[PDB]
């Protein structure tokens, strides 16, 4: 976790080291409870001793409310009072062992322990490697959602104004300006952002600790013996729920200006304002503006730091902006001002579906319509580009919709008649729709995705709001007929027929379950709908989407969310995308299966029996296919216990190419840090490895008609 005993008020993440771990755990062996009872016993083993301390740090608070006292030389007891700072008092020595431990770092330390305590209690899945054999400190951007670097002015001594702000009360309080400045930037950043963020870390890049014997103090190249650092980097763990709020609420209005309101007005200055709302409350709040290129977090920190720290500071985080720009900008009103987290376009498409959804019920048909289940990509907020009215050039314009009628014994028993009967139902639906609702336009199309079923006909509806829907009929007799085909098929042909079934259930049966759970899960994971789209965008640039089914990309991209360990839940566009890259780079799909718990953040969680059952499936498959030519990626879940539904038919070269791209990308990141040049390389295709390359151009520009 990148935790050390080194100083933290300087900026480095640490302050909790082996000695603090050892001293703490020693105290627990002597007590630690509110009633001074032993929480750890000398008879405990290593697992139990480690479990208790991790459990202890997770739930009992040592900084704000509550603190510990012990006697090194007397049972250790937990006090409810807190000193507002990480405190581990020693009455025998009168020494607080957590003095080096910063408040900001303490919350992160608490989060890690509690987050790990969950895996320690986990029984379904082994977690030994993640807890212990995985370094999360290699990349800050993977470990932190947002990173801003701030270039202080006059950096061979800091400007007189900033040096003057240091003040004598602060030399006595903070011995070094670095300690003071870190506190200054933290407090304003914490106060400014507030609930928008969970955790903040201030790192002083290029801080040295060793100097030659010939010198009295450390010498920094930019410091000039004045300040031992190059620049300050502000790292955050953002809160997706309230990151993008337009308005920052503040203390309520009153007859007499209250202290909390007073600091609010002083802190924000002109940006402060007193506003009323629909509910009728009068409160001091400041309003910001959403942008499709950068989050509200970038603007607030820029203004806050400049006003209070120094008006000459330069704040820049171009990496996120470049990531934001790569997301296709929809051709809707106020597209630029729209935030990346807004799903209004998807909802509007759903509303249009609802209007049609009503019409088809009220239409009289020989068989009562049972249920219409939308399964299109947009319905789960995964479409690469947001839906746009009348932008029919988009490949995803027509969203698949499943129509199912009441169970009847009159369905044809032979396949070819069955769909032709289904087409008859669609034909009548079109006629009545054309007559009763002329504003809707419709036409028929040929679907051949399912192999050898050349007669499935789909009805395409052009909605007046400007959206397209594709309707296909599902019949209960349909699925048994495919089973009938497999049974009667020749032994040599049976492997071919089961593949035909595999695609059928992928489109008709499993697709319903897929859209349902992803849609509901997407609400909790705010950044899922963006990151998946960039992931598909990244695949398209390297010509991988053609062989990778859209579902498989989604399941790979949700792994960092349902299984964020050892990392946290991503709350940034950059953090989510690169973590998907990290997983693919290190994924040994030949020996390691990928299985996901499609559940909301802490039922439907996989149990031991189900977990082992899926594991046996992987071993049996790999026994038949050890080298993994026939199957490469094993993606399974509650919806997919077989594990081969969405990953079958992928050529091995594309599977290897996918992993090869991910590995090299990570290698570039290690060699060269995230910057404008690198990110451009990530998203540009080499195109040289291919044996032959053919250039094609369309007669007209399709970007405008794609709603981009």
């Amino acid at each position: 976790r990148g935790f050390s005993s080194n100083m933290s008020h300087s900026g480095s993440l640490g302050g909790f080291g082996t000695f603090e771990f050892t001293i703490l755990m020693a105290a627990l062996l002597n007590g630690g409870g509110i009633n001074s009872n032993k929480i750890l016993l000398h008879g405990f083993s290593s697992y139990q001793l480690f479990k208790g301390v991790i459990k202890y740090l997770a739930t009992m608070d040592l900084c704000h409310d509550g603190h510990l006292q012990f006697h090194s030389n007397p049972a250790s007891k937990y006090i409810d009072e807190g000193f507002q700072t990480p405190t581990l008092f020693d009455k025998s020595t009168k020494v607080n062992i957590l003095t080096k431990m910063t408040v900001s770092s303490y919350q992160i330390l608490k989060e890690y322990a509690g987050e790990t305590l969950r895996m320690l209690n986990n029984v379904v899945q082994d977690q030994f490697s993640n807890i212990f054999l995985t370094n999360i400190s290699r990349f800050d951007n993977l470990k932190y959602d947002l990173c801003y670097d701030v270039q202080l002015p006059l950096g061979n001594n800091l400007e007189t104004s900033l040096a003057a702000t240091f003040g004598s009360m602060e030399r006595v309080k903070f011995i070094t300006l670095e300690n003071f400045l870190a506190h200054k930037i933290t407090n304003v950043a914490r106060y400014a952002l507030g609930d928008r963020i969970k955790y903040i870390q201030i790192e002083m890049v290029g801080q040295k600790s060793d100097f030659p014997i010939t010198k009295r103090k450390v010498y920094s190249n930019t410091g000039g013996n004045h300040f031992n650092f190059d620049f300050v980097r502000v790292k955050l763990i953002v809160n997706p729920s309230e990151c993008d709020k337009l308005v920052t609420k503040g203390p309520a209005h009153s007859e007499t200006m209250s202290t909390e309101a007073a600091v609010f007005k002083n802190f924000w200055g002109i940006k402060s304002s007193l506003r009323r709302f629909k509910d009728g409350s009068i409160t001091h709040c400041c309003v910001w503006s959403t942008s499709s290129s950068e989050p509200i977090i970038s603007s607030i920190v820029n203004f806050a730091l400049q006003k209070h720290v120094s008006k000459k500071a330069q704040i820049s985080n171009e990496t996120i902006k470049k990531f934001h720009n790569f997301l296709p900008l929809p051709n809707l009103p106020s597209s630029a001002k729209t935030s990346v987290l807004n799903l209004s376009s998807f909802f509007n498409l759903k509303k249009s579906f609802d209007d049609l959804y009503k019409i088809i019920f009220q239409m009289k048909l020989p068989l009562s319509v049972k249920s219409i289940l939308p399964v299109g990509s947009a319905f789960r907020y995964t479409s690469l580009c947001q839906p746009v009215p009348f932008a029919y050039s988009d490949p995803d314009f027509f969203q698949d919709v499943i129509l199912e009628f009441e169970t009847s014994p009159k369905w044809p028993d032979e396949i070819t008649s069955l769909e032709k009967a289904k087409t008859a139902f669609l034909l009548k639906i079109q006629e009545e729709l054309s007559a009763n609702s002329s504003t809707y336009r419709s036409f028929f199309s040929r679907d051949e995705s399912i192999p050898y079923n050349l007669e499935i006909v789909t009805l395409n509806i052009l909605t007046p709001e400007g959206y397209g829907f594709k309707f296909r009929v599902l019949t209960e007799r349909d699925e048994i007929l495919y089973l009938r085909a497999i049974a009667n098929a020749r032994n040599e042909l049976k492997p071919e027929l089961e593949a035909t079934f595999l695609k059928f259930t992928a489109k008709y049966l499993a697709s319903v379950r897929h859209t349902r759970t992803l849609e509901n899960i997407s609400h909790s994971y705010q950044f899922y709908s963006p990151v998946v789209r960039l992931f598909k965008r990244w695949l398209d640039t390297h010509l991988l989407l053609g062989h990778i089914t859209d579902e498989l990309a989604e399941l790979i991209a949700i792994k960092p969310f349902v299984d964020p360990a050892p990392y946290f839940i991503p709350g940034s566009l950059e953090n989510g995308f690169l973590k998907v890259l990290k997983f693919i780079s290190q994924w040994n799909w030949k020996d390691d299966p990928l299985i996901l718990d499609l559940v909301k953040p802490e039922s439907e969680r996989l149990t031991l029996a189900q977990y082992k059952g899926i594991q046996m499936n992987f071993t049996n498959l790999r026994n038949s296919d050890p080298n993994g030519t026939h199957l490469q990626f094993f993606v399974a879940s509650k919806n997919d216990p077989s594990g081969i539904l969405y990953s079958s038919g992928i050529p091995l070269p594309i599977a290897t190419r996918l992993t090869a791209l991910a590995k090299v990308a990570v290698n570039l990141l290690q060699t060269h840090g995230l910057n404008q040049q690198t990110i451009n390389l990530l998203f540009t295709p080499g195109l040289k490895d291919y044996d032959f390359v053919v250039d094609l151009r369309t007669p007209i520009g399709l970007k405008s008609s794609c709603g981009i």
Partner: peptide, 25 residues
């Protein structure tokens, strides 16, 4: 738990320092 316990023992011996260098220092 037994699997976890054996996993601990494997980790410890891997990171166990070589006693020869202890004499050297």
């Amino acid at each position: 738990s037994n699997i976890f316990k054996l996993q601990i023992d494997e980790l410890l011996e891997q990171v166990k320092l070589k006693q020869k260098h202890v004499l050297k220092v």
